[PDB]
């Protein structure tokens, strides 16, 4: 289970022109672009902070889930939660040959449990000494407008903070950064074997 | 259970002209200068914070509840609470034949526990692999004026807070944001198997 990203976000999909409206920089100056190189450096640093505390994705970039042994006999819950249209469960071999498999696997969409449950009571078997990478595109939407807005606000509450204080300097809201995140975190109570 | 919204708000349904009056009317600097479309972006962030803490809907948007297995035998509590009129309970199969049903169920509306509660003991079974899918319209009313005004004030107490201070800065009111929400939260005491 490695879970790397195939492609990153384009950067042009991030709302730098709206984050600048948030931070109260300035309206009609002739410069207007001295911060563009750094404002998206804090938006990518605040999304990636909330992508890890919530285990959500938010831009629907493509992922690659390269794993070897199945976690449970048939289920295989995916880590990145809001998914749609798993592309390919290409089953690599011990070395080399990569054979994509329709394989009779389904996809159960959920924000909490994005399973990949199999229908033939057993997922496609795994060549001993070989991995099973799964290409899937997981996230809310393609553009910034398709997000839940409270999670989009939690980026703006957080990336404004990184813009206003640079080093770790200490400085209570009703719905702060944390209270907006908490309905998107994963609530789990299993430490067991299954 | 994905539960994505079919359509969002139009934006013209939101009280941006009224929220400018809750921001500075009768006392203030003047009407002053506020990026109008910015003020729409804080109302959508305060509603989506109260739509999540209360599990209400507040604008009567259209929903699509596509879940695989029925939880109870017949009950199926709907999460987004103030509901009216299931659009359709179409039932897709594993291939996508999408055969709707038109009888066998009677939505029992309620602000506490909206249900589906089919007739007798038979609720439409699920094609194996073929997720069931329920389209409904949930919320109070089409315009902003049809809301309970205490819940509308919790938006204005919250959307003004996101306007007055940007980052997560520190700052116990009797009926604050939190005290106006708690009579609209869902009070549940089940952690059990049914």
């Amino acid at each position: 289970m490695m879970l790397n990203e195939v492609t990153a976000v384009p950067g042009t999909a991030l709302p730098v022109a709206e984050f600048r409206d948030h931070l109260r920089l300035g309206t009609g100056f002739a410069d207007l672009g001295a911060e563009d190189a750094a404002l998206l450096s804090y938006l990518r640093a605040a999304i990636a902070a909330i992508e890890g505390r919530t285990a959500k994705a938010l831009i629907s970039r493509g992922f690659r889930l390269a794993l070897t042994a199945w976690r449970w006999g048939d289920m295989q819950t995916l880590p990145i939660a809001p998914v749609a249209t798993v592309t390919a469960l290409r089953l690599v071999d011990a070395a080399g040959v990569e054979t994509p498999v329709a394989a009779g696997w389904r996809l159960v969409p959920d924000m909490a449990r994005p399973r990949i449950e199999a229908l033939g009571a057993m997922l496609p078997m795994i060549p001993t000494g070989g991995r099973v990478e799964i290409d899937f595109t997981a996230g809310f939407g393609a553009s910034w407008s398709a997000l839940p807005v409270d999670l989009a606000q939690a980026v703006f509450l957080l990336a404004a903070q990184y813009y206003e204080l640079r080093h770790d300097g200490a400085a209570a809201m009703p719905f702060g950064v944390m209270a907006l995140i908490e309905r998107w975190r994963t609530v789990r109570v299993l430490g067991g074997r299954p | 259970m994905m539960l994505n919204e079919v359509t969002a708000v139009p934006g013209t349904a939101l009280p941006v002209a009224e929220f400018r009056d809750h921001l500075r009317l009768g006392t203030g600097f003047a009407d002053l200068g506020a990026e109008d479309a910015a003020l729409l972006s804080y109302l959508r962030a305060a509603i989506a914070a109260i739509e999540g803490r209360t599990a209400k809907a507040l604008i009567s948007r259209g929903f699509r509840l596509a879940l695989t297995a029925w939880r109870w035998g017949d009950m199926q509590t709907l999460p987004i609470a103030p509901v009216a009129t299931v659009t359709a309970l179409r039932l897709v199969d594993a291939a996508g034949v999408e055969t709707p049903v038109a009888a066998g169920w009677r939505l029992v509306p309620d602000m506490a526990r909206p249900r589906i509660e089919a007739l007798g003991a038979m609720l439409p079974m699920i094609p194996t692999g073929g997720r069931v899918e329920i389209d409904f319209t949930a919320g109070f009313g089409a315009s902003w004026s049809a809301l309970p005004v205490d819940l509308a004030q919790a938006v204005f107490l919250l959307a003004a807070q996101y306007y007055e201070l940007r980052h997560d800065g520190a700052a116990a009111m009797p009926f604050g944001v939190m005290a106006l929400i708690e009579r609209w939260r869902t009070v549940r005491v089940l952690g059990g198997r049914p």
Binding site: M1, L3, G52, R53, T54, A55, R71, P79, M178, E182, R185, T186, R188, L190, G191, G192, R193 | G192, R193
Partner: protein
């Protein structure tokens, strides 16, 4: 009432064994903040060191290093045995009380009232069986005699019923040891045809 106590106290322990979440502990993970989740990379690491090295009979007592943030709070199960155990065992005796069986015959636990089954089986066929049978047989002696011409009596035997042998030893050895009265004078007492 005592049936519904015994039915529901027995179903109390059934549904307690079916609806109960006891954990043998809880690995609490707070974090730097008051709240913090752990990533699914870290979470599958936490299962595999718990699945393999800590759960089960064979891993009972590993020393379990806890780094910063982690903490293990072991839970208990404070009423362990005896969920309505005596009120069930008291209601199981009041059910046996009403039908009239002694507690020794049915097999319920309880204090030794009768001694050694020569009493409790003799008490059973004298307080709740033979009074019941001599009342039903008295109704068959009268209903069935309405179909006949002559009336017939119909009573329990109260002889060669092997639970009454302690009342039969006691009555044969009393008159058998009375050597003063003659042989035919005690055959008429024990119920024998005299010779």
């Amino acid at each position: 009432v005592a049936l519904d106590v015994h039915n529901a106290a027995s179903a109390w322990s059934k549904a307690l064994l079916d609806n109960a979440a006891r954990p043998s502990g809880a690995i609490i993970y707070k974090g730097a903040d008051g709240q913090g989740v752990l990533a699914p990379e870290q979470y599958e690491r936490l299962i595999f060191e718990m699945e393999t090295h800590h759960q089960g009979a064979r891993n009972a007592g590993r020393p379990m290093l806890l780094e910063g943030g982690l903490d293990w709070k072991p839970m208990g199960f404070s009423p362990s045995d005896m969920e309505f155990h005596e009120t069930k065992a008291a209601a199981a005796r009041e059910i046996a009380l009403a039908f009239g069986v002694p507690p020794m015959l049915i097999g319920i636990p309880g204090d030794a009232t009768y001694a050694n089954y020569a009493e409790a089986n003799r008490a059973f066929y004298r307080l709740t069986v033979l009074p019941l049978l001599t009342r039903v047989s008295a109704a068959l002696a009268w209903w069935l005699s309405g179909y006949l011409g002559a009336q017939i009596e119909l009573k329990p035997d109260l002889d060669q019923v092997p639970a009454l042998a302690v009342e039969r030893d006691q009555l044969w050895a009393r008159i058998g040891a009375a050597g003063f009265l003659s042989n035919s004078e005690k055959r008429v007492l024990l119920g024998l045809p005299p010779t």
